[PDB]
Symmetry: C3
Subunit: 53 residues, 3 copies
Amino acid sequence: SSNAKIDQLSSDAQTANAKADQASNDANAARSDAQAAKDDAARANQRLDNMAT
Amino acid sequence: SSNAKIDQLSSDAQTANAKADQASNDANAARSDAQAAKDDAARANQRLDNMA
Amino acid sequence: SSNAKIDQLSSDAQTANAKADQASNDANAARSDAQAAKDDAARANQRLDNM
Ligand SMILES: [Zn+2]
Ligand SMILES: [Zn+2]
Ligand SMILES: [Zn+2]
């Protein structure tokens, strides 16, 4: 475009789309690790509950 | 609008905003979920700490 | 710009980019906290291994 403002807004939209995709990917990764943490903590509580006298 | 280029820009802007809102919600929920996981791990160690 | 549509698009594009930055920072914080939670759950199981 011959319009500087139009080129800038196009750049902003593209940069925003890419960043959003990356942020969602990272959020899902965090949720996966969060689940791993919860599962391992439950494992510890189960081992404690199943201890022999 | 009959300006084709302006229409494409409108579409790109709308998609970008929609995705940013989607990612903002995802990130907010994930931070909260991570705190819950931190609390769960802390509670497991607490049970080990308080056992006689 | 005397063109209202162009101004509105310029604003919306900048706002989307700012919101994406916010989401990036929050996602990064969540990954860090989740990792710390994983490490602490591992600490609990290690303590049990030594009993
Ligand atoms: Zn240009
Ligand atoms: Zn049109
Ligand atoms: Zn203007």
